[PDB]
Amino acid sequence: MRNRREVSKLLSERVLLLDGAYGTEFMKYGYDDLPEELNIKAPDVVLKVHRSYIESGSDVILTNTFGATRMKLRKHGLEDKLDPIVRNAVRIARRAAGEKLVFGDIGPTGELPYPLGSTLFEEFYENFRETVEIMVEEGVDGIIFETFSDILELKAAVLAAREVSRDVFLIAHMTFDEKGRSLTGTDPANFAITFDELDIDALGINCSLGPEEILPIFQELSQYTDKFLVVEPNAGKPIVENGKTVYPLKPHDFAVHIDSYYELGVNIFGGCCGTTPEHVKLFRKVLGNRKPLQRKKKRIFAVSSPSKLVTFDHFVVIGERINPAGRKKLWAEMQKGNEEIVIKEAKTQVEKGAEVLDVNFGIESQIDVRYVEKIVQTLPYVSNVPLSLDIQNVDLTERALRAYPGRSLFNSAKVDEEELEMKINLLKKYGGTLIVLLMGKDVPKSFEERKEYFEKALKILERHDFSDRVIFDPGVLPLGAEGKPVEVLKTIEFISSKGFNTTVGLSNLSFGLPDRSYYNTAFLVLGISKGLSSAIMNPLDETLMKTLNATLVILEKKE
Question: Which CATH architecture has domain 301-559?
Answer without folding.
Answer: Alpha-Beta Barrel (3.20)
